[PDB]
RNA sequence: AAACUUUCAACAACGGAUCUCUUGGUUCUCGCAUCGAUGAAGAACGCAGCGAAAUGCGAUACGUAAUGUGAAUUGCAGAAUUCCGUGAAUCAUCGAAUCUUUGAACGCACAUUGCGCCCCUUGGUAUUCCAGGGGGCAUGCCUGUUUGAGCGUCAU
RNA sequence: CGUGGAGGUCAGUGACGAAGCCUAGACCGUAAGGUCGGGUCGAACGGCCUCUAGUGCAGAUCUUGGUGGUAGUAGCAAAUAUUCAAAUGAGAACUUUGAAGACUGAAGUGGGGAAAGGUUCCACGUCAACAGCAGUUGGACGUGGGUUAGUCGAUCCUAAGAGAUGGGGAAGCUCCGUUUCAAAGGCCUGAUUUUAUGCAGGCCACCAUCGAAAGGGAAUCCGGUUAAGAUUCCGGAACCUGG
RNA sequence: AUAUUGGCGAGAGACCGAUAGCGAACAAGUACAGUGAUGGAAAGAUGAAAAGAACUUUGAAAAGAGAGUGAAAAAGUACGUGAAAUUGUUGAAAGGGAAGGGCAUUUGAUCAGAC
């Protein structure tokens, strides 16, 4: 149960906030868990997903496949990993839209800001 | 009326630039609900009223 | 692409005017090319560069005028602060705290004390 | 507009709605370094302003049109 | 809402040979003009004994 | 281009079935006419010939 | 001949465009707008017409200045600028 | 674009399309089209349609008269090109695209995409890679989006 | 006997009920006090690389500056100083600016994109003629300043 | 007996198929109704004990939406009138050109304009809807091009009239009035040399402003030119005002 | 201490569920009407994902038939489910100036229980 008077348990308000969230809020809404290896390595459970991470699909028809993120489509609430596509007989290939909560990050894209963010969340870097 | 004022000619120029169908690249957008121009005007169909 | 305001702030007046007329010539020839081609994605960057240069020139002149009117009574009305019309018309703290000598002596003699009942 | 160049030394420009014939003549002399004989103007049915600028015979509009860069 | 089913301008056309005597929306050119109004049996009208 | 063309052709269908002569034809018919469904006729002056 | 033959003699105008409200309600012989009341200083509105007040009230336009007053109040009518780096 | 390592230039050779015909409005365009039809079925430069060409001396008055002729001929060619009576022959640059980039990036409509904005149709109705499903527009978008090109 | 009419059943039409849904409405409670001559509310006309609206904005025109976040936007095009960055973006924040023609609307007028006057400057040989740029010129009232009026009135 | 919600219970039913809908199948009740099978469908819903109501329709010349018979019926009959060949095209009573026959008959079915409309003008592409038959055609649909002035108008003047100011009414929104019972404003000579323009030394009777694209009014003609513009563009030849 | 159908920010309900609830769940004070003051609508739902039907063949074409995508086109931008009025085809029956109903049985068709 909630205790604060500023939190709302209203389904209409929650659904309106989700469907009219802006881009910088959609960044945090599209978060993905780490692997057990990276979790034991870094001390972090989940991170927001980025355009050059190597993931693994753990749910759905494409469960078991790997690849790099090629696009993070924040408008369509989805992510597009390379080499996970549906092909046609005339030679076309459309990408599959995946949700990031049904993926596992296996390798990060580490720069200055992500190192600061992991140290902010209270992980280790050595 | 072939001898008009600048105010009338200005409103006529805006109404001329507004008279177009829908651009086709707008139909291809993500979650597009505009299917036609619902405010199209024609000279013999409906009048401008100055 | 485009100009950067932190790099424009290290320049002077005639240098900013020269950069302004260069960008204006470039926008002119880009409109000439747009007459033949519909999609030209450099027009947006040249327009934002012109707006940035104009912003920096205006803020330099306004800073000069503020230093010229520093400290004086009767500054110009746009350099004056704008809260609201009612806030500008209200009394100041000095006029609000003006007090008669009779009341001032009364507040000196008998101010409200601190006390407790408990013991 | 192309026909008028090889006809009467006439360049055709789109100008601001706030400009008059003195300002048009002065701006053409400033921008292209020529001498102007005449300026005729109209307001178009789409709401813009168009000027026909006739140059003097010691100048050629074909040269300016090549410089500007649309011919 | 205390004004629901009352924000319209309508008048009864009278006793005649064709239509019933409900108040009807006047005007022209919209599809709503000529339609019945204000009754609890009319579409868009007020309800019987509105809740307080 | 042919995708958007087929889109527009499938979208104009119901307007075509209502026989509008374009997207600018928006004539609205009223429900009932007062001059056709009001009044009575006496022995004096009448409303139509 | 009070109907359709006399509807053919209908080619002048009683009202033209207004300058304050822009509506075509400006009577040319009265020199008065029958909608906004121009050129009177006060804008014409009545309490027996509430739908017209609802049509022309505040918030039906752009609100070019009033839409920022609540933010300026909440921030406290501050002046100056912001500092960098949180340092 | 904003690319710094690019070339920007106009072609200098033109090609007459003899299966097209359209009466022009400019008198210089009509005279120049008479010269072009006299020239033949080979690519031509605008300098070759001059009357001062070829040079019988090295004196620069023939250069000045040829440049004035070119100034008139550009105005003629502007209307001859507008009505598809004549087309330009293009300038090319050899360019390298990585195969792993080609096979990693994907097309939504493989076989059915073409240009529809080009003017020559033999480029535009061409498949570079037929049994992979990549067209000319998609191949040039891959070449533009690669940084290792 | 068929056809035709009517009844009964299966399938197919016409039409949009019922069911399931819901980024909307409606009512109640809590907290707060902030429009305008420093030009408001409202109006007109414009502005996007490719838009008619809705939503934004004013010739710096779907925006400029500053501050935060930290890699997108997406229909296409295009983003190295877009990229281990003094940095995407219809992102959030917003304290600096810009703010056409109007409107209480303020030089006069306005069914007109009409007509003036003053100051500084630049160009035409020019205090007198013409043109461009910049800055001004409403009414009522209050306090003060200056110039005045009246045998209203005092001393010379 | 039945319906929408609420509290409790059946650790109730349900993707091995909830609710709804159809059913020349089955059973129970005097009845309101309840229950089972089959088909269709794809995500929620019941029994009992209680609480509550915007709780049950054949009608109101009821409201809104939909659909019939009449019925392939009435009708598509004012304005004297059409025919032949070729071309185009999937297709021609109706489009284009040619060959014929007619009509308007200069108070024309001709050539221009004023109110009003607003791009309908013209070119290219082109037929789903519209043109009460048709359509390859169009004032339709899609994309563009086109309106050039010292002399033509407006702008200026006043007409019938409208209307501020100074004043005077009215609780007030506002009313009267237009030179009024007001200290109502300009030309210049000055003198000319802080020298630039303070007084000038004579004036000053009129009182704002709006009101005519047919009244009053400074000045332009001819020839050529476009797909579409011209007393405006080009060529030639004039005139008027101001300096 | 009291008022508050406006403005700004929040939290809720034995409230309504697209002919209801505000006129407006959607580019709604919009489209459209009127000289004017004013009057004033209709209109939500493919699918998890457009993967929105490539290719062959008949046709001038719209389209059809194959094929294909999909869990399903008994989901094809006329798109969840698809009632009634009204209509088409097939099967069964009746019919010498209406049709329908009650009691009773014959004929044909069809059907459950059960020993
Ligand atoms: Mg209207
Ligand atoms: Mg003119
Ligand atoms: Mg209601
Ligand atoms: Mg008359
Ligand atoms: Mg009148
Ligand atoms: Mg807008
Ligand atoms: Mg302003
Ligand atoms: Mg006038
Ligand atoms: Mg005083
Ligand atoms: Mg209820
Ligand atoms: Mg219930
Ligand atoms: Mg279960
Ligand atoms: Mg079921
Ligand atoms: Mg039955
Ligand atoms: Mg029951
Ligand atoms: Mg229960
Ligand atoms: Mg009831
Ligand atoms: Mg009922
Ligand atoms: Mg009924
Ligand atoms: Mg009854
Ligand atoms: Mg009905
Ligand atoms: Mg018949
Ligand atoms: Mg008849
Ligand atoms: Mg006849
Ligand atoms: Mg005929
Ligand atoms: Mg005769
Ligand atoms: Mg005759
Ligand atoms: Mg005569
Ligand atoms: Mg035509
Ligand atoms: Mg044509
Ligand atoms: Mg027809
Ligand atoms: Mg037809
Ligand atoms: Mg057209
Ligand atoms: Mg008066
Ligand atoms: Mg006048
Ligand atoms: Mg006149
Ligand atoms: Mg006379
Ligand atoms: Mg003509
Ligand atoms: Mg001439
Ligand atoms: Mg409703
Ligand atoms: Mg309604
Ligand atoms: Mg009418
Ligand atoms: Mg539906
Ligand atoms: Mg289905
Ligand atoms: Mg249907
Ligand atoms: Mg039925």
Swiss-Prot record, chain B:
**UniProt key word Ribosomal protein:** yes
Q: What transmembrane ranges does the database entry give?
A: none
Principal localisation = cytoplasm
Q: Compositional bias (Basic residues) at which positions?
A: 6-19
GO BP: cytoplasmic translation
According to its UniProt record, where is this protein located?
Cytoplasm
Q: Where is this region: Disordered?
A: 1-21
Q: Which GO terms describe its molecular function?
A: structural constituent of ribosome
Alphabetically ordered keywords of this record: Cytoplasm, Ribonucleoprotein, Ribosomal protein
Can you list the GO cellular component terms from the UniProt entry?
A: cytoplasm; cytosol; cytosolic large ribosomal subunit
Q: Name one Pfam family in it.
A: Ribosomal_L39
> Subunit details for this protein?
Component of the large ribosomal subunit (LSU). Mature yeast ribosomes consist of a small (40S) and a large (60S) subunit. The 40S small subunit contains 1 molecule of ribosomal RNA (18S rRNA) and 33 different proteins (encoded by 57 genes). The large 60S subunit contains 3 rRNA molecules (25S, 5.8S and 5S rRNA) and 46 different proteins (encoded by 81 genes). eL39 interacts with YIH1.
What function does the entry list? Component of the ribosome, a large ribonucleoprotein complex responsible for the synthesis of proteins in the cell. The small ribosomal subunit (SSU) binds messenger RNAs (mRNAs) and translates the encoded message by selecting cognate aminoacyl-transfer RNA (tRNA) molecules. The large subunit (LSU) contains the ribosomal catalytic site termed the peptidyl transferase center (PTC), which catalyzes the formation of peptide bonds, thereby polymerizing the amino acids delivered by tRNAs into a polypeptide chain.
For this chain, the family text in UniProt reads: Belongs to the eukaryotic ribosomal protein eL39 family.
Its protein name is Large ribosomal subunit protein eL39
Curated annotation (Swiss-Prot), chain C:
Q: Where in the cell is it found?
A: Cytoplasm
Which family is it part of? Belongs to the universal ribosomal protein uL29 family.
In UniProt terms, what function does this protein have?
Component of the ribosome, a large ribonucleoprotein complex responsible for the synthesis of proteins in the cell. The small ribosomal subunit (SSU) binds messenger RNAs (mRNAs) and translates the encoded message by selecting cognate aminoacyl-transfer RNA (tRNA) molecules. The large subunit (LSU) contains the ribosomal catalytic site termed the peptidyl transferase center (PTC), which catalyzes the formation of peptide bonds, thereby polymerizing the amino acids delivered by tRNAs into a polypeptide chain.
Origin species, per record, is Saccharomyces cerevisiae (strain ATCC 204508 / S288c)
PANTHER family assigned to the protein according to its UniProt record, in alphabetical order: 60S RIBOSOMAL PROTEIN L35 (PTHR45722), LARGE RIBOSOMAL SUBUNIT PROTEIN UL29-RELATED (PTHR45722:SF2)
What extra comment accompanies this record? Answer: There are 2 genes for uL29 in yeast.
Q: Which UniProt keywords apply?
A: Cytoplasm, Phosphoprotein, Ribonucleoprotein, Ribosomal protein
Which spans are transmembrane here?
none
Q: What is this protein called?
A: Large ribosomal subunit protein uL29A
May I have one GO cellular component term? cytosolic large ribosomal subunit
Q: Which Gene3D superfamilies match?
A: 1.10.287.310, 6.10.250.3450
CDD domains membership: Ribosomal_L29_HIP
Looking up InterPro entries in the UniProt record yields:
Ribosomal_uL29 (IPR001854), Ribosomal_uL29_CS (IPR018254), Ribosomal_uL29_euk (IPR045059), Ribosomal_uL29_sf (IPR036049)
PTM Phosphoserine: at which residues? 12, 49
GO BP terms, alphabetized: cytoplasmic translation; maturation of LSU-rRNA from tricistronic rRNA transcript (SSU-rRNA, 5.8S rRNA, LSU-rRNA)
Task: Please name the Pfam families in this protein's record.
Answer: Ribosomal_L29 (PF00831)
A molecular-function term among this protein's GO annotations? mRNA binding
From Swiss-Prot, chain D:
Q: Subunit details for this protein?
A: Component of the large ribosomal subunit (LSU). Mature yeast ribosomes consist of a small (40S) and a large (60S) subunit. The 40S small subunit contains 1 molecule of ribosomal RNA (18S rRNA) and 33 different proteins (encoded by 57 genes). The large 60S subunit contains 3 rRNA molecules (25S, 5.8S and 5S rRNA) and 46 different proteins (encoded by 81 genes). uL23 is associated with the polypeptide exit tunnel.
Instruction: Tell me the compartments it is located in.
Output: Cytoplasm
GO cellular component terms, A-Z = cytosol; cytosolic large ribosomal subunit; preribosome, large subunit precursor
Q: Which organism is it from?
A: Saccharomyces cerevisiae (strain ATCC 204508 / S288c) (Baker's yeast)
Task: Briefly state the protein's biological role.
Answer: Component of the ribosome, a large ribonucleoprotein complex responsible for the synthesis of proteins in the cell. The small ribosomal subunit (SSU) binds messenger RNAs (mRNAs) and translates the encoded message by selecting cognate aminoacyl-transfer RNA (tRNA) molecules. The large subunit (LSU) contains the ribosomal catalytic site termed the peptidyl transferase center (PTC), which catalyzes the formation of peptide bonds, thereby polymerizing the amino acids delivered by tRNAs into a polypeptide chain.
GO MF annotations for this entry?
Answer: RNA binding; rRNA binding; structural constituent of ribosome
Biological process (GO) annotations held by this record are: cytoplasmic translation; ribosomal large subunit assembly
Q: Does the keyword Ribonucleoprotein apply?
A: yes
Tell me which domain of life the UniProt entry assigns to the organism this sequence originates from. Eukaryota
Name the gene behind this protein: RPL25
Curated annotation (Swiss-Prot), chain E:
Q: Where in the cell is it found?
A: Cytoplasm; Nucleus
Q: How is it modified after translation?
A: N-terminally acetylated by acetyltransferase NatA.
Residues that the record marks as modified (Omega-N-methylarginine) are 43
- Output the superkingdom of the source species: Eukaryota
Q: Which cysteines are joined by disulfide bonds?
A: none
Give the protein family.
Belongs to the universal ribosomal protein uL4 family.
- What's the domain remark here? The eukaryote-specific C-terminal extension harbors a nuclear import signal and delivers the ACL4-uL4/RPL4 complex to the pre-ribosome, triggering uL4 release from ACL4 and incorporation into the 60S ribosomal subunit.
Record's subunit section: Component of the large ribosomal subunit (LSU). Mature yeast ribosomes consist of a small (40S) and a large (60S) subunit. The 40S small subunit contains 1 molecule of ribosomal RNA (18S rRNA) and 33 different proteins (encoded by 57 genes). The large 60S subunit contains 3 rRNA molecules (25S, 5.8S and 5S rRNA) and 46 different proteins (encoded by 81 genes). uL4 is associated with the polypeptide exit tunnel. uL4 interacts with its chaperone ACL4 and the nuclear import receptor KAP104.
The misc remark on file is: There are 2 genes for uL4 in yeast.
Q: What is this protein called?
A: Large ribosomal subunit protein uL4A
Point out the gene that encodes the protein.
RPL4A
């Amino acid at each position: 149960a909630k205790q604060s008077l500023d939190v709302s348990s209203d389904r209409r308000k929650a659904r309106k906030a989700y469907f009219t969230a802006p881009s910088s809020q959609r960044r945090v809404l599209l978060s993905a868990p780490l692997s057990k290896e990276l979790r034991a390595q870094y001390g972090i459970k989940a991170l927001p997903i980025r355009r050059d991470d190597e993931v693994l699909v753990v749910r759905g028809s494409k469960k078991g496949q790997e690849g790099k993120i090629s696009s993070v489509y924040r408008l369509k609430f989805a992510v597009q990993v390379d080499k996970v596509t549906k092909e046609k007989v005339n030679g076309a290939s459309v990408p599959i839209n995946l949700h990031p909560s049904k993926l596992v990050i296996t390798k990060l894209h580490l720069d200055k800001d992500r190192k600061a963010l992991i140290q902010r969340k209270g992980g280790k870097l050595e | 009326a072939a001898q008009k004022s600048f105010r009338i000619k200005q409103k006529m120029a805006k109404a001329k630039k507004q008279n177009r169908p829908l651009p086709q690249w707008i139909r291809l957008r993500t979650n597009n609900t505009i299917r036609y121009n619902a405010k199209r005007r024609n000279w013999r169909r409906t009048k401008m009223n100055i | 692409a485009g100009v950067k305001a932190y790099e424009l702030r290290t320049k002077s007046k005639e240098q900013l005017a020269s950069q302004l007329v260069d960008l204006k010539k470039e926008l002119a020839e880009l409109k000439v090319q747009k007459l033949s081609r519909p999609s030209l994605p450099k027009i947006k960057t040249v327009r934002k560069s012109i707006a940035c240069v104009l912003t920096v020139i205006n803020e330099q002149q306004r800073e000069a005028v503020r230093q010229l009117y520093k400290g004086k009574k009767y500054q110009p009305k746009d350099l004056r602060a704008k809260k609201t019309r009612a806030l500008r018309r209200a009394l100041t703290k000095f006029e609000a705290s003006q007090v008669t000598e009779k009341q001032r002596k009364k507040q000196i003699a008998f101010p409200q004390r601190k006390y407790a009942i408990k013991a | 507009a192309m026909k008028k160049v090889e006809d009467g030394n006439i360049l055709v420009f789109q100008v601001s709605m706030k400009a008059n014939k003195y300002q048009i003549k002065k701006a053409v002399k400033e921008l292209y370094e020529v001498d102007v004989l005449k300026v005729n103007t109209l307001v178009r049915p789409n709401g813009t302003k168009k000027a026909y600028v006739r140059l003097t015979a010691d100048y050629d509009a074909l040269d300016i049109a090549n410089r500007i860069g649309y011919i | 809402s205390e004004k629901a089913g009352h924000q319209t301008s309508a008048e009864s056309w009278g006793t005649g040979r064709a239509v019933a005597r409900i108040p009807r929306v006047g005007g022209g050119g919209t599809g709503r003009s000529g339609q019945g109004a204000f009754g609890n049996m009319c579409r868009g009208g007020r309800m019987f004994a509105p809740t307080k | 281009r042919s995708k958007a063309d087929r889109m527009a052709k499938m979208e104009r269908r119901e307007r075509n079935r209502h026989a509008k002569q374009g997207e600018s034809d928006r004539h609205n018919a009223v429900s009932l006419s007062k001059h056709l469904f009001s009044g009575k006729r006496g022995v004096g002056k009448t409303d139509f010939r | 001949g009070k109907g359709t033959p006399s509807f053919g003699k209908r080619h002048n105008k009683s009202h033209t465009l207004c300058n304050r409200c822009g509506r075509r309600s400006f009577h040319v012989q009265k020199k008065t707008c029958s909608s906004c009341g121009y050129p009177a200083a006060k804008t014409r509105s009545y309490n027996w017409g509430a739908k017209a007040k609802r049509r022309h009230t505040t918030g039906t336009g752009r609100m070019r200045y009033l839409k920022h007053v609540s933010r300026r109040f909440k921030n406290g009518f501050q002046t100056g600028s912001a500092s960098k780096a949180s340092a | 674009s904003h690319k710094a390592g690019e070339l920007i230039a106009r072609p200098g050779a033109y090609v007459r399309d003899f299966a097209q015909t359209h009466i022009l409005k400019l008198k210089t365009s009509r005279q120049l089209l008479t010269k072009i039809d006299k020239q033949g079925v080979y690519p031509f430069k605008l300098s070759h349609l001059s009357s001062n060409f070829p040079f019988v001396h090295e004196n620069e008055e023939e250069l000045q008269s040829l440049k004035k002729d070119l100034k008139s001929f550009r105005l003629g060619m502007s209307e001859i090109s507008n009505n598809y009576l004549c087309v330009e022959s293009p300038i090319q640059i050899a360019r390298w695209v990585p195969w792993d980039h080609i096979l990693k990036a994907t097309n939504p409509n493989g076989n059915l995409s073409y240009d529809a904005t080009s003017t020559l149709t033999l480029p535009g109705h061409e498949l570079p890679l037929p049994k992979l499903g990549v067209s000319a527009i998609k191949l040039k978008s891959l070449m533009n989006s690669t940084k290792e090109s």
